[PDB]
Amino acid sequence: QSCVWYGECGIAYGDKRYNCEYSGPPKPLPKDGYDLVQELCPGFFFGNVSLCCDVRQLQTLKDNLQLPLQFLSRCPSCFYNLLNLFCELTCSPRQSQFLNVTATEDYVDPVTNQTKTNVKELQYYVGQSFANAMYNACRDVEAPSSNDKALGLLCGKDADACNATNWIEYMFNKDNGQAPFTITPVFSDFPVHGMEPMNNATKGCDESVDEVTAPCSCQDCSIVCGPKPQPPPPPAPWTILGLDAMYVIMWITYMAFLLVFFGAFFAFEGCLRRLFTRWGSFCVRNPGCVIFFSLVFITACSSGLVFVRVTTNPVDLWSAPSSQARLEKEYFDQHFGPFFRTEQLIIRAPLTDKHIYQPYPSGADVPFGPPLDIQILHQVLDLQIAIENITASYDNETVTLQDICLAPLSPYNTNCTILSVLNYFQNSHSVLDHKKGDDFFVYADYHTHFLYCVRAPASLNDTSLLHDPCLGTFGGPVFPWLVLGGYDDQNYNNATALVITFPVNNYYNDTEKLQRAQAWEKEFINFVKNYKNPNLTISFTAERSIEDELNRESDSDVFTVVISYAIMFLYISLALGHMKSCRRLLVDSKVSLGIAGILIVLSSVACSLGVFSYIGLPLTLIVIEVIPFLVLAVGVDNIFILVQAYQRDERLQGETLDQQLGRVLGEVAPSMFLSSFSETVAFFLGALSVMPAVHTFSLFAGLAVFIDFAEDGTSVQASESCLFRFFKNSYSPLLLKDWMRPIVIAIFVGVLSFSIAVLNKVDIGLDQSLSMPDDSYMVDYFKSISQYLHAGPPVYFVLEEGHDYTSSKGQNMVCGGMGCNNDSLVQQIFNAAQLDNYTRIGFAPSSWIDDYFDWVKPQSSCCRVPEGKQRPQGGDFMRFLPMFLSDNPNPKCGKGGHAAYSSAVNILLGHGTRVGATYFMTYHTVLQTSADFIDALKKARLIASNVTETMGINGSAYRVFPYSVFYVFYEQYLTIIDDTIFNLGVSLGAIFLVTMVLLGCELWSAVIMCATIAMVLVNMFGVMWLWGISLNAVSLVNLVMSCGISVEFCSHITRAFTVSMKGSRVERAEEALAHMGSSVFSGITLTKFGGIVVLAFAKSQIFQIFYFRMYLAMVLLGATHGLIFLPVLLSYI
Amino acid sequence: RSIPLGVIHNSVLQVSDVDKLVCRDKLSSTNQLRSVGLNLEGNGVATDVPSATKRWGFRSGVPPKVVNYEAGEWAENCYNLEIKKPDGSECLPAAPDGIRGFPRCRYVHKVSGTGPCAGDFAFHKEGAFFLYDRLASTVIYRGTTFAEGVVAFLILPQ
Amino acid sequence: RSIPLGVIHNSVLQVSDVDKLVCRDKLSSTNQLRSVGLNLEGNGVATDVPSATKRWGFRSGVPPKVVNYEAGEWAENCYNLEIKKPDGSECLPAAPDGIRGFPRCRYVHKVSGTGPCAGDFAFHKEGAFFLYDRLASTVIYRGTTFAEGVVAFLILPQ
Amino acid sequence: RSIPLGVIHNSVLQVSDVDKLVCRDKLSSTNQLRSVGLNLEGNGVATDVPSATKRWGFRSGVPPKVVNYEAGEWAENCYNLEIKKPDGSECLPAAPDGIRGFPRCRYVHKVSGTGPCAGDFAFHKEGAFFLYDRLASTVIYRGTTFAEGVVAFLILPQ
């Protein structure tokens, strides 16, 4: 083994040295060079480390690595072979085999005058295969942020002219101003005149350099690339449903035809109860006090229980508690509580054009969208600074953004967190205004930094001539997707919108601090609303917009319903007693039910919004049945009055009917104890139902009687009219309603198929105020970013190997997410992840860093490591040490010094084994619809299952958690399918069982009433999934009420028809329905007559425009079916 | 107010003119007259474009001028500029017909972008010429390789 | 068929040529040769544009010609014309590269409009030249200030 | 490396130069120097365009050159070419300013169409010139009548 040089001699040019000629054997490297050799040329680091280089040469090699690193650092395999080319030249103990000195000159030591010899030039015999592999591993590497190949910057020519041998030739030519002296390469896989070319093994860009150094990326490599995604599923059925409906229709038609052809070819208990009731009445018919006294008692119980009208309604608790939805939210809290909320603005520049700007030294045309005009950025910065300076007052105190913001690096840094493109310029007008240029070029400006910072937002030093940091003033990177909108692919320069985001404390556990934050928010909303700049359109996130709009909009419409309620109760008042006899009752009846309900609920605590539309419209049941019992008696007139004339007309039609009506109602509201977020309003009303029932018992009858004994004339006429109507109805049924009845069946059939073959969750569409609209419009337009978090809490974490396995799970999750997409982009996640396992790894290969104590004090630097061999081991496993260091950070360590810390961990003392709870979050955009977010949530749950299902263990111990400002809120829209089927199902049983608690005709009554259950439902669904309909936490309650009123109708028509004393074919039926038809047109008609004022009327928002919309439609359909349904059933019988 | 003329014997370079050309000095053919372009590069001269532009500047009201030269030297550094005004139109004039790039460059700084362009033409602040292919101009032409230089006129031996 | 050459001593202007230049007449440098442009204005030469155009006319088939001159005189009246054809296109050719307005005018009749333009080029009916900046043309160029004039060639004293 | 100069007495055409011009040979005026363009046509020189193009060819990288001549001869055949490239743009350059058709042609082969145009300029394969109106070019110009020819330079008697 022999050298050609050893050590450094004279200056060549600049700061550059020739090496000293030396032709002896290699020399063991001093221990003081072991770090350098381990770092640069670890292949030589064994035995006596006998090399043809000294420590000075290795230091010089390290110092010269800056420019290759500048362009190749991202692809370790590419850089590795290059380093080996230089290591072999500099240090190989067999230099003489592949190097031949070709020029020299004297070196004279200035002090001793001893002569040595500069190696001025030499020839280097490089393997052909080595050179080609070195080029091959680097040829796809892309410059840090640039569609140009890194080799175009290291080859003295463009990348399309760069080849393996001319690249090496260029690097080795002193003319390049970097190489200290020229090395002339000769490329051969064969010996050349006894020289044995350097042909060291090489690594491709698809290979790992070592155990702690991964292969190169796709973006910077070719070998390790592909394949894209191919898991797209395409479903689409439905026609089947249509065919079935059609088939059914055909069958029906056939049946009808057949029928036509044929015609051409040819109880005790109940009674007893009634009797008892009558007896009671007769007794009661001997005193008014008792009754009223009872009403008075109810006046108290109702009002009494209403003590402390604390009937809350806020804030966002309707998904109900318990289960996973709530339990999951609570869990994430104990670990961190409320991650926090964001006030967010989207900003566009409608009066500004795009523009071009060549960035040195490429000079390629890069277009920049309207909002990235330099002047609009300055204007957006002024907006931003003004927002930071907003103050609100609460009590006598002042509230700033600095009091409520996420300031991640407090106290050492109170700097608030503002996600904005302006934070790439540290929110500084001057810094952004800067621009290093001369008479010839602009070398660096607000463009270069931008194009660099979108690729390296954590950088504390632009690689351009500006040398400005990218890191935001809050101490963390601002990711480009989260601050720009309306750009294509990752061409952030083409953005048509800026997004500005301020995280502020939600203060879920602190009431006094939350109120202060909400005071600030109100000022923020005001500031934005009144901000004047023709150059910018600014639009909303906040908090009140969604909470203030609902409480600010939902009011005017009140006057609508209120009015309608009055005009309706007026008619129902005129109807029967007309005068001041019936009015009193009702007013008391409606009050009793409403008052009683509030009292029944006060004994358990509860409250709600829709709980009002139900309470009011629900009261109808009490009025309807109550409005027909009195009317029927009015139509009475025999040998008796008051005495038996009241018990024979009351305990005869009111006993059974009412008795059955009250039950069918209590069964729908009573058994409302189910599982969901509506049982409260439900039960409360159902309870108010028996109450309202027992009320109108002796109260209405007695009162109506006690007092019942121009106005008279009017009553008679109405009665007469009713009678006439009944007669007409009878006549109609007499003819033949078989054809139309079949047609009706068709309508129901078509409805079931059209209603069962549509569906939907529920979106958010509030009135057109302003704020809310802006946020809704901005969201629709924007895209790519704006977020929620998927999040896991994990336990244990102590077995180096289980951490490696958990990291593989984590990396795999990042992949699927960055893949799963839809239409023209991903849907699932976003997405990507920054747990921490990578931070630790980075440190192992990094250095220390400075911490500067606040306000003053000497600098503190402290740390260490642990390479080379150990380095790989340390990073591989163990974790207490790393963990306790990694949690305490706030100043990088290498070429700069910034902040790169976080949170989520919280062990005790130095028990690193007890660490919790690491949390990884990938924010994904959506804002599509109630069904869109629900679909994404559905995917995330399966994602959580897949990760937890992959590698589990013992029983239970934490799992996946998808907490996104949309869950708990949409969590309900999840089990909506089972709810509807379960909710209605529970009523179908309570109704079929109740209607039998005083009958049990097997198929007679059972089917009669049972048919009404599916009869009306198909209508509600049709209108909902058919025309102007909807569905949600309310619609579900809507369907419930529907089945309720429906039961009411049927109940009366049927309890008196089924029996039928003097029985017949279809004659007795027409007789009963007659006395029941008059009431069907009274309450029903009126009720509709009221909705119209509510439905046919107007409003200032679609909100109720639907709620009270279907009501009238669904309520109307049910009423119509009442008469038809009964008639059809009778005929069938 | 007179252009110097260099007279060479074997190696005697005497800066004379016909305001001296001794009655023993022999000019027998016009083929003895040559103009030469020499390059301004080397130590001190900004070899990098940011330093090089400092020697050039934009000026209006001065018409460009061209003069031929018949021989020059290999240049280590040449320049080739393309510049858009802020409004996107062209800042440097197109090379006039018959004006081609300097023919012998080791390396060309070939660059393109946008700049303020605060004048009609780009000149040399030191009063030198932009040397193209055997034509020297007072001005920079668009996308056309030049070396910086100066011209001399000589009388060569028979 | 020969251009006259003026020879001046102290004040002797004799219209000679080299077809006479006595063997005692001294031409020792080409710097003694000057061409001069003299203006045609004054009494009997109308100044208003309607009267002035009568001295010019449009003609086709005759190629324009230019000749340099090195000195001229202050002009009391100059002209600067811009003319659209009836179809709106340009009637006068654009000033060729390096042709600028006559440099010393007391007053410029600078006018623009439309006219019949019954020929390719506008010439001088009296056979004079349109004098621009040290170039004399047989023709009028668009939007370019000229004086009307004639050229003489002289031999100046040493 | 020297252009021949023809000397004529009464009818003595001796191809000389100033590299011989006897000390008895009289050049008393520059008016005695004439350049002449002579035509290349006649027996063995095909006239139809398909045969004529065989004498010409397209070439890139060679700048066109022009030289004046003062007299020529009547041509029996001239040519006037217009050629579209396959993409429809122009194959031959427009005649530069001041270059007009050869002035004396018995017959002009005036033709137009499209062709491959495999070069920047069309040259003469035999090294002759395309003669236009008292200008000879190495190249063919669009829509401009030329004769094929060569140039001589003469000294005429006093």
Ligand SMILES: *[C@@H]1O[C@H](CO)[C@@H](O[C@@H]2O[C@H](CO)[C@@H](O[C@@H]3O[C@H](CO[C@H]4O[C@H](CO)[C@@H](O)[C@H](O)[C@@H]4O)[C@@H](O)[C@H](O)[C@@H]3O)[C@H](O)[C@H]2NC(C)=O)[C@H](O)[C@H]1NC(C)=O
């Ligand atoms: C919280 O954020 C604050 C700003 O939002 C941080 O203080 C800001 O720091 C900048 C940078 O200095 C100040 O800008 C000005 O700097 C010039 C001088 O420019 C210098 O630039 C760098 C170093 O600054 C250096 O390389 C050059 O040689 C220049 O000397 C000064 O002349 C101005 O006075 C001004 O400081 C901002 O003004 C300053 N903001 C405030 C409010 O003072 C602050 O450091 C952050 N806090 C933490 C804990 O990081």
Ligand SMILES: *[C@@H]1O[C@H](CO)[C@@H](O[C@@H]2O[C@H](CO)[C@@H](O[C@@H]3O[C@H](CO)[C@@H](O)[C@H](O)[C@@H]3O)[C@H](O)[C@H]2NC(C)=O)[C@H](O)[C@H]1NC(C)=O
């Ligand atoms: C949005 O950004 C994309 C970049 O992803 C832009 O595409 C770019 O288009 C320009 C042309 O305007 C391309 O430059 C071209 O260069 C050729 C040859 O040098 C030249 O002939 C053309 O005139 C043009 O200058 C550029 O290569 C290309 N960039 C990419 C991605 O390759 C696009 O124009 C932008 N448009 C939007 C979204 O507004």
Ligand SMILES: *[C@@H]1O[C@H](CO)[C@@H](O[C@@H]2O[C@H](CO)[C@@H](O)[C@H](O)[C@H]2NC(C)=O)[C@H](O)[C@H]1NC(C)=O
């Ligand atoms: C160039 O290749 C040689 C041969 O593989 C490397 O030398 C070996 O290095 C390993 C790693 O330390 C040792 O185990 C072997 O004993 C070495 N073999 C010989 C023959 O010396 C060398 O490390 C490579 N050069 C570089 C710079 O990595």
Ligand SMILES: *[C@@H]1O[C@H](CO)[C@@H](O[C@@H]2O[C@H](CO)[C@@H](O)[C@H](O)[C@H]2NC(C)=O)[C@H](O)[C@H]1NC(C)=O
């Ligand atoms: C690519 O590199 C090769 C050398 O490996 C260059 O080689 C020569 O090519 C030029 C023309 O470009 C010839 O004039 C030389 O005579 C060739 N020499 C040899 C030994 O082959 C090649 O030019 C380079 N091409 C590019 C685009 O960079």
Ligand SMILES: *[C@@H]1O[C@H](CO)[C@@H](O[C@@H]2O[C@H](CO)[C@@H](O)[C@H](O)[C@H]2NC(C)=O)[C@H](O)[C@H]1NC(C)=O
């Ligand atoms: C809206 O944009 C315009 C254009 O940048 C701003 O107005 C000024 O523009 C004029 C004309 O170019 C400049 O001379 C001024 O320098 C600009 N104003 C100032 C104060 O410098 C205008 O200010 C912008 N509007 C707002 C509200 O910021």
Ligand SMILES: *[C@@H]1O[C@H](CO)[C@@H](O[C@@H]2O[C@H](CO)[C@@H](O)[C@H](O)[C@H]2NC(C)=O)[C@H](O)[C@H]1NC(C)=O
């Ligand atoms: C940013 O890093 C660059 C690295 O190029 C520094 O610029 C030069 O770095 C070299 C180290 O090789 C120093 O010798 C020079 O002194 C630096 N330039 C200057 C102008 O001195 C730069 O110093 C770094 N700056 C920051 C703020 O990190």
Ligand SMILES: *[C@@H]1O[C@H](CO)[C@@H](O)[C@H](O)[C@H]1NC(C)=O
């Ligand atoms: C160097 O160490 C090797 C073994 O690693 C040994 O064989 C050799 O003798 C040693 N040489 C010297 C000079 O120490």
Ligand SMILES: *[C@@H]1O[C@H](CO)[C@@H](O)[C@H](O)[C@H]1NC(C)=O
């Ligand atoms: C090295 O190679 C050169 C030819 O490039 C040769 O002249 C010289 O003698 C060689 N020296 C040794 C030690 O091989």
Ligand SMILES: *[C@@H]1O[C@H](CO)[C@@H](O)[C@H](O)[C@H]1NC(C)=O
């Ligand atoms: C040695 O160097 C010294 C300067 O330190 C100088 O004075 C002396 O002349 C030198 N002598 C030799 C050996 O050249």
Ligand SMILES: *[C@@H]1O[C@H](CO)[C@@H](O)[C@H](O)[C@H]1NC(C)=O
């Ligand atoms: C590297 O070069 C080889 C042949 O030299 C080629 O087959 C291979 O495709 C190249 N690497 C790439 C482009 O992945």
Ligand SMILES: *[C@@H]1O[C@H](CO)[C@@H](O)[C@H](O)[C@H]1NC(C)=O
């Ligand atoms: C809520 O705040 C109280 C103190 O006000 C604290 O004791 C409790 O731990 C907090 N809850 C959580 C979940 O951190």
Ligand SMILES: *[C@@H]1O[C@H](CO)[C@@H](O)[C@H](O)[C@H]1NC(C)=O
């Ligand atoms: C910010 O508020 C302060 C109050 O001290 C005021 O002096 C200053 O002008 C304000 N700056 C703005 C409007 O940004």
Ligand SMILES: *[C@@H]1O[C@H](CO)[C@@H](O)[C@H](O)[C@H]1NC(C)=O
């Ligand atoms: C504000 O409160 C302080 C006590 O904290 C009191 O001294 C001061 O007078 C109050 N000022 C006003 C305007 O309320």
Ligand SMILES: *[C@@H]1O[C@H](CO)[C@@H](O)[C@H](O)[C@H]1NC(C)=O
């Ligand atoms: C879940 O992972 C399993 C393998 O464990 C895989 O078969 C399936 O495709 C994955 N599904 C989703 C939705 O990620």
